[model samples]
Target: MKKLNIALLGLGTVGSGVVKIIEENRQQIQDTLNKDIVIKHILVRDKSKKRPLNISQYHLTEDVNEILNDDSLDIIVEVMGGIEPTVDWLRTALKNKKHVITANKDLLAVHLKLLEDLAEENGVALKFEASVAIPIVNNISKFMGILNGTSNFILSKMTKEQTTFEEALDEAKRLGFAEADPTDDVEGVDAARKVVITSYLSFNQVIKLNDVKRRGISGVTLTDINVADQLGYKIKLIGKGIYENGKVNASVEPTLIDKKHQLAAVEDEYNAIYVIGVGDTMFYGKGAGSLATGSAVVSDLLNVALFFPHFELEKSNFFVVVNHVKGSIENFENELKAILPFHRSLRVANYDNQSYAAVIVGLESSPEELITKHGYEVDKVYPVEGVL
Candidate 1:
């Protein structure tokens, strides 16, 4: 029987859950695959901290260098959610020719190409399914697709139950499906980043965060969902990646969804993604939860352990274009009043190099109005777009 040695990078919420699941399901996993998977090491900030789950003390370590330098490790499982040390360490791990599985969307969003190139060069595999929507959607057939999981949740709730953004998000957060910050989940950046990674796998193209325009549900109010309902449309936070003018003009924004669409039926914290192909039909379903995501990680582990034994995956250099363009806030305010015809909250932030402008208007207003009147495009609005 074949056995694989695994190293865990963190012991946070998801990381602890991974440990629990692996132990609880170890017999089933081994029985199914005829192989034993063992956790040999775990990198922690404080080894003295009391853990939620009981495990071997020999496996836990405070110094990450110990794991990086360890000669016996085969795979590194990273559930630490960040960009800095996680990214830097993952690079080193892959450089050491060890396979990696992660759920860090922020790191993956910005460093996918680099990781992919490096993984390929070093003969290692980098797998990330939990980074986007939870619950692995494997055996995927990717052509040209528009996959926005959070949008599907918002749209479903509005169309089926006539629920408001606040109502839906409140329910989601309560269920632990969403984070306390909720900025990335409600905004299209999370979905956009997930889709961008998928796009890279399908088209071999590197879609940067700057290139993907994003909008959030913060500016969307109860009335907008109601108005869209009255009009036989559901409001959805869409992350559109379109091939336009020989380049990708990807934007994440709140858009009006036709209630009759299949995607319109997806409700609550449960996520669904739409995959549009040239000659194939659209695919959609529930994309949420940790066990669901863990299954994805486990599946990737199996793929690397079983079928593709000879080939090595690499994470190499990929380009990310983030140009500093200031937004016109006064112009946006004027445009909202002209197009939306409703009173709501509005805010704008000018960053070191980039700018983010947002407005929460009445429910009856059309998202299309932003493009027509404000010179602001919807498909690319990010950080926070709508939720009045």
Candidate 2:
């Protein structure tokens, strides 16, 4: 996955909080979205004074030229409150082919058209959706949730049955939870919009609908889910509203979280919103209540036909991949590290059956296909049904 490099054009409440949230949630952001967000630079009005956060000295710059000219930066997010110099800086940012995001409705009310036209001409994205609605506390850092029923149910089915996205989606429709047009939920539009509203309430920021980065659940595959399960994580469509350092960041995507996490355990038609900073709060129940098929408990009963016996699910530790190859463990690890994406693979605890070997991979391709290409033979591939 490519990195998302950003330059913040202010270090006020929004900018400071932006850095805080991004840094704190770096893992979840990367784990779920498969993108690394790096704060390339931060523009500050005063460099001498103490800032709210202890940001790196090199990261803070006094000139827009310093921020805009750096080709490595992809987005310029403006929280600086002004119209004159700020507009010109943002315009140059567009010219530099850097995507722009802003919270200065102050400048936008005037030059929204000018900047938008320039953005179109340059074929770059221009965003300023400073935005939100959620219960607020002075220290509410984040809310992570299974916010959409249709997507969550589909993901649950996929993880349990190794079902394809199309098959899982079809099942949601058959269970009467997914609507005729499932695009909004599957593609992340529905959850992202919901994220913006929640961010607004929590942080008093009016974030734009599309400003928050989004990855839909559609591209998530049976193989992806299967692999994550093996790595002690579960794939959940997560929507988050984060408030920190007096700023807000919201996002929605197919998130891979530890199976032990509460959000990972929420099953079909259930929605959960967990808040940090209120002493670890949790709110969850049926995703929808008023409609006739609203009680999707029936969806659970329908899947009973596909359910395996209880002993199997309770007996495994992860998705275990047994390998049979002629090599030392250290040698095999070197080979495993060289070929996998980002050179990542999990080394399991000693396999009980000493006669064989195993290498747990969380990768883009199937374990068999990926291992075979590297000259190792896969004996069997399956998820752990119970804990050790």
Candidate 3:
């Protein structure tokens, strides 16, 4: 049997979990792939610090150069979350011809095109299934669903019962689903990054960090949530990806989903991604955790190990939908009518001059054909790649 050498960067929360998975599931992983994946080296900030697990001394290293320069290491798994060094290290690692896996959405969102270009140029595999949600197998990978855990919980509560924003936020914090500060996750920055990554895979276009219009659940008060519930709608953190105007328009915000809509029923930390492409589809499952994220990362690793020699990353020929230019509501309404028949039940809910606007429409038809037919300019389209 062939053997693959692996290096780990960081042994913190998820890093330790990675180590645990490799150790606990060694036989199963090897049996599934028919390859021996060994942890050859670990890159950490400190070499002498105590660790959760008993790792060999020879596997420890504080400098990144040692790992990047190593010829024996076949894959580099980066669980060290950040922007500057992680991004820099990944670029260099690819240059050195190492297959890379990461859970860093921050860097991925800002440097998507450059990184993808670099990885393809180096002729190696690059996967980050753990970046968005925990347990890494979130529906975003399949390009079908969204994972806004904080918003999902809020919506779940608002639909089934009533809870003030503060109350719900407190509950989330207590439950470990939310961070103390909770700005990134709540403000939709985290969700935006996840969707942007998916959009890159779906449309084969670059999604800039500034390109995403972010709205948080903070402003969604008890009043809004209650109103939505009363109207037979569920509040949700919606990451809208439309292939319009020959570009991708991706944004994250609070949405009022009809109780009957597929997206409306998604609640709590549980995630669901809806995809409308050549077919209709949905991906539903738990969207967070070290194990879940580890599952996704491991799955990607297996694919790399299996297809290492023949793997080739290619740009998909799909145009993104975005609205960079200012347009009138009349124009917007006309655009809607062209693709989807107007229904009294569906009404325009919100609008902005730039970036995004939301309209409630009867879900009798899928918007995929209409979006493609109208030649909409958008930044990103939905049903994330590898999802459905």
Candidate 4:
């Protein structure tokens, strides 16, 4: 039987899980592909550090050349999280005609088209199914959902335990739902990256991370959570994208979801995405962790191993024209009042020395209008998921 050699770019948490999957399911994977799968090299920062897997010392190397120069390798799996060196390395891998699979959202969200073009030019495959929680490929009119598991877990704790923002965040960190820094998750930076990727895939357009208007949960106080609950709503950090008149309006912010809405039921470290097109459909699952993310990476690897050699890239007629809107928040509100359901009935309450505004507008209110146009800094925003 023919054997395929694979290289790993990182041996961290997700990377470790990938190795475990390969070892645990080696027979099934090889049987399905009708070939022997072998791990040729693993790139790690420290060869001396002990790992959960008992990897062979001969296969471990800190040098990039050891893996990249190996002409015998057929695939490069990258779980390393960062942009600069990873992008450069992946570019080299694609140029060398090695199939590439990554779970790096930050890299792919910023340089998807450039990398996709490179992959096409080189007659190689570049797959990143595990980048976003659930990948959306095409034909999406609008999408909104909880994208960040850490943030969601924190918010859920605040709602259920009635804890303060800091307390909830502390709990998330203690449970490993959040990182030591937690800036990306709590401040909405992570969710913003996710929405940018979703907008690109749904609209077939190129979206920069700056194009997304972001608001984190840091400013959310116990009082705000209580107010939302009193109003029969659940506060969630929501990433939303809408295609409008040759442009995509995207945002990541805390939203007030109605108690009766389906998304209100999504709690803890779980993710739920609601998409509208060809009728409505929803995808719900555990958004993060070793096993979930690892399984996604391995699935992409199997797909590339089975079909990428002969796969063709079809020309897309759809082009992206990013629409940057400029207007006052008051004017934006006027536009919403004119078109949005129950706009006239909506109420805004001033809180925290006018630093926050609690409004009962439709759950799908435009966050960009509130943040950029009105200059109202958002602490949290959720669509009342349940009925009034």
Candidate 5:
């Protein structure tokens, strides 16, 4: 086909950018894809509303069925976002055998699996990359940052900020990012203050510091920090907002951040926030918030025709904490191998305590099997995200 007919499901930021890129790079897209690309029609909420795009009034429509039922339309780019229609609309688009492209993370998180199955059965392409189209902020997820002079500074100054948590503790004297009490900073109450501010903009709600579910860094002993390190994670005081069903649960707490994550590299006095949805980007910076995933939608349009140019739980991880015997730790390691059979190393906590905890590496049969077969106390498992 010399031309690929594309119908943008939403004419918002993402859809508009898709229009701009296709027209601006029309020639290169044509040469590279071996087909001329066109945003044949854009499905919008208001056709009467004026947009600056240089398109005729005839090009936009309020009814999605007008585009979805069009047998000539080859691609359905669902940047319109949200559940219900966006999901069901894309579902119908796939049933109609139209290739779909989007960076709608929410939709993907909830409905991608079902849609993908349908797309596969129908022999149509459904694709997206939660591409962060704006700045360097990552589109990986929505996230929060480090706060207070002492905790962050203390976490940073310790051992080039590279070693284990307990190993990297102390030293806010000369510059004094701390006060005489050190209670607020060291205990992480200051982070709660920042959490209030972040929660405000993220959810557009009036969130009081008291409303935030908070726990201080002081609550975690240095040994606990060290334990987190052994578990292949960093203990960071972070602010996070979990949004679901149009409500937000925001908090500041000590979290187990996997070292492999980008925010895990953030150290001392440097604050970073990874935002999703609204800004649609992941960010780790000297301060918090301020991210945009706008550009990702544009790339989807280009990649869609370019022979489909290739390519979190809001940044968190969950692990089950189980108990182990100190004397039989060696055997425990071997047991871990049998359970995981995949992991070479085990993320155990402490070897000092005799009848204590050093194990609980999540997840599947490993923890439960350890409980049933060998009899281990599998403590509660919780979700955690890092604050950069």
Candidate 6:
């Protein structure tokens, strides 16, 4: 049988899961690919760090050169989540004609086109199915979902258990859904990165992190959740992107979803993404955890190994521009208040002299515009999807 050598760049949570899956499912994978997949080397910060998985000391190395210089290596799997040095490593691997697979959403969101161009120029495959929602690929026009499992878990806890934001967040951390420093997950930055990547794939245009209007659920109080429930709605932090009038408007914020909506049913760490165009479809599954994300990375590796040579790059006709929309909370209130519950009777809660309003608004108004118009600052604005 043919031997396909691979290198792993990080033996942390996801990396360990990848190794476990590859080992446990070795027979199944070998049968599917008709080759024995071999893990040659693993790049780590410390060779002596105690890991959960049993790995040979010879396979672990602190030097990246050990992996990059290996001409026999067919693929470089990166689960190390970062932008700087990881980008450099992947660039080198792609330039050397080694196929690349990653679950790093931040790096891919910012440098997707650059890496795609590099992969094309070098005649290699760059697959990142694990970065977005699920493994389902499509020519979608609009993308929206609960991208961050940490945030979703916290929100679900808040709504279901009727716990305060801090309490729910604490529970999330205790359960391993959140990290010690949960800034990226709680502040909507993580979901923003995923949204940017989704928009890039849907419209073939690059959307930067700065382009997304982000709002975390940190400010979401029990009052907001209670009001939403009383009004027959569930509050969810939704990462949404829509293509209209030659531009893409993407944002991540806590949304007031009606109880009848499909996404309202998605709770806890489970993720659901809606792709609208031609026919409506939803992809739902566990969005995070070591095994779930590791499975996604492995799936991408299989696709690259099995069918990358026959892949044809499709040219995009639309020169999609990413421009932030402009409008005020007043405009949003006037336009969408009728449809949203408690329209004019919406009450504002004040803390530290800062006012927080829980009102549903259409995307007709931009986040910046709302901030500029309302001097008090709109704490969170949830976009009402499927409505104009």
Of 2 and 6, which scores higher on TM-score? 6
Candidate 4's clash total is 19
Q: TM-scores across all candidates?
A: 0.67, 0.43, 0.72, 0.78, 0.46, 0.77
Per-candidate clash tally: 41, 21, 44, 19, 9, 0
Q: Number of clashes in model 5?
A: 9
Q: Kindly give the stretch of ten consecutive residues in candidate 5 with the minimal lDDT sum.
A: 132-141
Q: What Cα-based lDDT does every candidate model obtain?
A: 0.61, 0.64, 0.66, 0.73, 0.60, 0.74
What are the per-residue Cα lDDT tens digits for candidate 2 across 1-388?
A: 6577777887765566666666666686668755677777888888887776774644777877888789998777787868889899989998988777665635422266578779989877665442211122214577777777788889889888778999999998888878889988798776776676566555556677767778888877765676566667787878887676666767787666777777778888787777776267777776332121111211221122123125453011223344555555666656666665552345743332431334444344345667677766665443322122
Model 2 misplaced regions, further than 4 Å: 1-138, 291-388
- Model 3, CA-based lDDT: 0.66
Candidate number that wins on lDDT, 2 or 6:
6
| TM-score winner | 4
Residue range 1-388, candidate 6, lDDT tens digits: 7788999999888899889888888898788767788999988889878886875543888999989999999999998878888898999999999999987755745586788889999999988754345543635677778888889899899888989999999998888889999999999998888888778777777878889989998988777777566656787889988787778988898877778778889899887788886677888876556788898888788778778535465111100011122354454335333433232133222222223343333233434344445442444444444332
Report how far off residue 146 is in candidate 1 (Å): 8.8
Question: On residues 40-133, what C-alpha lDDT tens digit does candidate 1 reach at each position?
Answer: 8888888878766765544788888988888788899887777888899999999999998887756643487788779999998988765333
RMSD of each: 11.2, 21.8, 9.7, 8.1, 14.2, 7.8
Q: Candidate 3 vs candidate 5: which has greater lDDT?
A: 3
After superposing candidate 3 on the true structure, give the runs of residues whose Cα lies further than 4 Å from its correct spot: 1-3, 24-35, 54-58, 131-146, 309-388
On a 0 to 100 scale, what is the lDDT of residue 3 in model 1?
78
Ranking by TM-score: 4, 6, 3, 1, 5, 2
Residue 27 C-alpha lDDT in model 6: 95
Per-residue lDDT, model 4, residue 326, is 39
Model 1 misplaced stretches (Cα beyond 4 Å): 1-3, 24-36, 55-58, 131-181, 221-223, 244-246, 278-280, 308-388
Candidate 3, residues 1-388, lDDT tens digits: the string is 7888999888876777788878777898777768998999888899878777665543788989989999988999988878887889999989999999886646654475677678999999888664343422321222434567776776676545677777878888898878899888788887787677767766666787668777777766555555444545556787766665567777776665656667767678777667655455666766556776666677778889989755565112111123553576556656666565554333332222443333333344345466656666543322212211
Query: After superposition on all CA atoms, how large is the RMSD of candidate 2?
Result: 21.8
